[PDB]
Write a protein that binds this ligand. Sequence first.
Ligand SMILES: Cc1cc2nc3c(=O)[nH]c(=O)nc-3n(C[C@H](O)[C@H](O)[C@H](O)COP(=O)(O)OP(=O)(O)OC[C@H]3O[C@@H](n4cnc5c(N)ncnc54)[C@H](O)[C@@H]3O)c2cc1C
Ligand SMILES: Cc1cc2nc3c(=O)[nH]c(=O)nc-3n(C[C@H](O)[C@H](O)[C@H](O)COP(=O)(O)OP(=O)(O)OC[C@H]3O[C@@H](n4cnc5c(N)ncnc54)[C@H](O)[C@@H]3O)c2cc1C
Ligand SMILES: C(#Cc1nc(-c2ccc3c(ccn3C[C@@H]3CCCN3)c2)sc1C1(N2CCCC2)CCCCC1)CNCC1CCC1
Ligand SMILES: C(#Cc1nc(-c2ccc3c(ccn3C[C@@H]3CCCN3)c2)sc1C1(N2CCCC2)CCCCC1)CNCC1CCC1
Lengths: 485, 486
Amino acid sequence: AFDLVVIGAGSGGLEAGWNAATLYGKRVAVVDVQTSHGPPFYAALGGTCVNVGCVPKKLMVTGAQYMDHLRESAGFGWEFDGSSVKANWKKLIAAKNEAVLDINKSYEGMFNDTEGLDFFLGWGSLESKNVVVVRETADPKSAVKERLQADHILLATGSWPQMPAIPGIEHCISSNEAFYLPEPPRRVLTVGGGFISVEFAGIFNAYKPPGGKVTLCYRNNLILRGFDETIREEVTKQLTANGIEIMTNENPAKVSLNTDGSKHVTFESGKTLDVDVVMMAIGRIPRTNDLQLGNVGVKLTPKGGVQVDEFSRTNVPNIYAIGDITDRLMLTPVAINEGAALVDTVFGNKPRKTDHTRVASAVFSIPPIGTCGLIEEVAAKEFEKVAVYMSSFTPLMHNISGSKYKKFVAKIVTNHSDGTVLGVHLLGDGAPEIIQAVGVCLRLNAKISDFYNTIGVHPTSAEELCSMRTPSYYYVKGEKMEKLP
Amino acid sequence: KAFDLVVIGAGSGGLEAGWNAATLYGKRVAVVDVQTSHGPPFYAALGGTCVNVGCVPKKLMVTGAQYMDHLRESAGFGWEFDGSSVKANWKKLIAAKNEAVLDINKSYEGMFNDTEGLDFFLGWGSLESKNVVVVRETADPKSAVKERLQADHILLATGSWPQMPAIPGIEHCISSNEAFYLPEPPRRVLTVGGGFISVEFAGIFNAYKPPGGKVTLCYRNNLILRGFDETIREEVTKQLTANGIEIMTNENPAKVSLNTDGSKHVTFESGKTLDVDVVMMAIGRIPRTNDLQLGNVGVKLTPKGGVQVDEFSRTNVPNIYAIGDITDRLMLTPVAINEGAALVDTVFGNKPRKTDHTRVASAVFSIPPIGTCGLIEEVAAKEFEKVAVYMSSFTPLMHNISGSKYKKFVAKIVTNHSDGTVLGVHLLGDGAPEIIQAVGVCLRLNAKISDFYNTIGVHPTSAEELCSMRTPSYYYVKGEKMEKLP
Ligand SMILES: Cc1cc2nc3c(=O)[nH]c(=O)nc-3n(C[C@H](O)[C@H](O)[C@H](O)COP(=O)(O)OP(=O)(O)OC[C@H]3O[C@@H](n4cnc5c(N)ncnc54)[C@H](O)[C@@H]3O)c2cc1C
Ligand SMILES: Cc1cc2nc3c(=O)[nH]c(=O)nc-3n(C[C@H](O)[C@H](O)[C@H](O)COP(=O)(O)OP(=O)(O)OC[C@H]3O[C@@H](n4cnc5c(N)ncnc54)[C@H](O)[C@@H]3O)c2cc1C
Ligand SMILES: C(#Cc1nc(-c2ccc3c(ccn3C[C@@H]3CCCN3)c2)sc1C1(N2CCCC2)CCCCC1)CNCC1CCC1
Ligand SMILES: C(#Cc1nc(-c2ccc3c(ccn3C[C@@H]3CCCN3)c2)sc1C1(N2CCCC2)CCCCC1)CNCC1CCC1
């Protein structure tokens, strides 16, 4: 029998398994449906992040940024045969595939060289409070390969893309298939306002063949809901400046195939659009339907997530749940932190719970976003006096590069009673790297005075965070006003 | 012409002090400088050395140089074009760089024109008496007087100047001032000096050199970038060598002569020789005290050459102050800004503030760049009983695909191991200058190592390495380097 069985060899499942086995000598089993990236199941050993998430996403955005580099280099005297330029999508994917497969292999080797840490290929599910069955397929009636006896069971199966119930949805893809398109689409429509749709819009915009067009549609008025609103409006503009068509207050109603294999999209508003690819990126839902949670009584939240307490425990004793399946912060480092904290509490004498506040995240759009803490309108409903410090500027190089539209935005939100910084929001190149150390600042409850009394590093964009001393406006009892009464 | 404040030197520190005194405390301010825009004959001008012949132009040209790597590295991500058609136009880079600096010059002139009690005077300032700044047509005390500015307070803020060694043929060499206006990119160039100016210009010249070119950097001691973390000093040496730059350590030029075609014949103290088209001296910058007539009123200099000041920027003469490079401490623009702002708060706002010169974050825009804040381990070991070093070094994944496998990232955290306080952070790699900024805020808060690795990381970034080091790589006990503790 195993001290612990983990269903899902992803960001959270692997941290919890490795720690419990190497730090505490416990006997661990880990189940995943594949050993290497790709169809049919896309995610595999490593998790969504390694196989069809952060890692290949970052590589493909890097590749897409070269479209700007090539164009901007002329402002600094560089020339080359523009007509010979080709963005070879098939080589990008091949390089991504080999980079991901290398990670797949190293995790494979990890299991083969760690005693007390074993991997089982198959589909895991709950047969009882103490048994995880491994079948050949997600079908509960498929052949059994294993029945793992477990003193503790960890649910860490991640999440799965959400798809709307419209006629012709089968002709639409999600981010999973976008990583494996054999050719770069000339015309693509990304559906959604979230970070996945924006990031892939930039990727497709760079590698599209001549005559191409990337359209992004969103059912409400402003994309990237949940991010700072100044950044939301500015990123919309800068995407438009780089050729992406942003189509707000629109939503697909049906999709049919044209005689050439392209898709005819009809929107609820009657508008129509023909594209080669339609990528649904309207949300990620917890991946629970294959686990047979009813066999055991694991309760879910109203919106489909596995309900846990601040220590990641389900209502069933000795059954825990971490990561995206809990439907809180769908971030890789969070799932790692929840995995490590769980094992410390269960297999050690050090109870530890992960802080889900003041977590720094990023969006690798072109231009990128970096954020940590509360946006202002949320803070306005939680604090009596709120100050907003805002600063927009054109970085030095973009006065020469030919990309004047690349304005950098820095915003700081404080509790104005004592100047405690509640949120920092950045837009512009470098923002993802700038914001990491800002997260450390907010654990230490840094005040605005701690930022503008720190001496800047010149010339940097991050310098701006230490150059703001006077609020641009306030919120008192939830009311926006420039000057205080 | 009775001013509250007269500033000699319209630079980084001088401009901050004059603007604060005028706009925040309604004081009448005069500011003196020798030009209103960048370039010859005097190079620095309205805006200072940073705007005109320092950080700002330096940065734009390094950015242009980085496109040599971008264009090569793009192939790994599927980008295809005619490699043989790639050319770098140096005159376009200079021309574009001049436009951007002049826009800053123009902007500053409009600030003076539109702000009450903030007047600009063109000429050369100097001390006539304790309360009189005289402005002449040239730096020569015999040149004609333009104004005598009556001043209740005087601020010395003239910056620094490139130091040129007294070797035969020095007249055939240049400094960084002239490098910003070279009509052509040198095919062969020798940057003399191991500091950040020489390293950064090596990167620039390496990217824009015509075919068959070579950049050589020489330094009289064994390892370049003294003062920085030793690991990073060695890695940048490797990564400069990896990008084609010959480093020539333990060598120092002894003379320069002219060849028939106009090139320079360099003879080193070791008897070695080298032929280059340009010799750029960047061995140091010295405080610019020679034209101020400090002896007239008796402003004292330190044993080192800078204007002696107490922690509130006050000189030995009452109502005369000095900030910035002329005080010859940390020759950084943001420090001169901070010193100038603290000076005005103290003098005019009865708000006594002084600049903290410790834990200052700074950068080197080498390719790849450096970001640093706080102490290096050698210095912390002489100052703390138990010291620990957390170290992580690796080639990022993107640079495996890009083909630049030599671009090893380096993160190092130095701590006082007795309580875990972070004493210094040192970075090498893309984004290091941007990462290190908020690290200065962390060190201002006396952050501890645990504050870093208990912060949730941002993935995937280089910065998140700073939050995933929790076990020291080695220690310094009583100044002795060891891997494990006793
Ligand atoms: C396109 C995209 C980009 C992203 N970019 C980022 C980013 O930049 N930064 C970031 O922090 N996060 C990002 N995320 C989110 C991140 O990938 C997840 O938050 C992260 O994987 C944490 O999830 P987890 O560890 O809980 O589960 P995962 O890491 O998803 O692992 C779940 C694993 O369980 C397996 N599994 C599922 N069901 C079963 C079953 N029945 N039996 C056996 N195995 C099963 C799956 O194959 C999978 O490998 C991105 C996600 C996507 C889709
Ligand atoms: C090539 C180079 C690159 C650099 N890069 C960086 C960097 O990346 N980051 C950074 O932080 N720092 C950098 N520095 C340093 C930075 O430029 C200086 O530390 C900063 O400009 C000093 O400001 P200051 O106020 O002391 O005087 P300065 O800014 O030097 O201004 C002094 C001014 O006084 C004027 N002046 C001189 N004598 C007289 C007189 N008799 N009468 C009237 N006016 C006079 C001059 O014309 C000059 O404009 C760099 C310096 C150089 C040379
Ligand atoms: C990694 C890794 C890693 N590689 C290991 C490993 C690697 C190789 C192994 C073994 C055991 C045997 N081998 C084979 C030997 C040793 C290396 C090659 N040959 C173990 S163990 C390991 C770690 N765990 C794996 C699952 C998550 C925790 C993560 C890194 C710290 C050490 C543990 C990359 N981390 C980046 C992520 C993205 C968010 C953080
Ligand atoms: C700056 C600035 C700045 N511009 C000002 C300014 C600029 C223009 C002004 C006035 C007052 C009137 N004008 C003219 C306006 C312009 C449009 C209409 N008329 C004031 S005031 C000002 C500040 N300092 C004053 C002395 C120089 C720095 C810094 C920014 C906050 C305000 C003061 C940074 N420039 C970027 C480069 C990168 C290295 C430096």
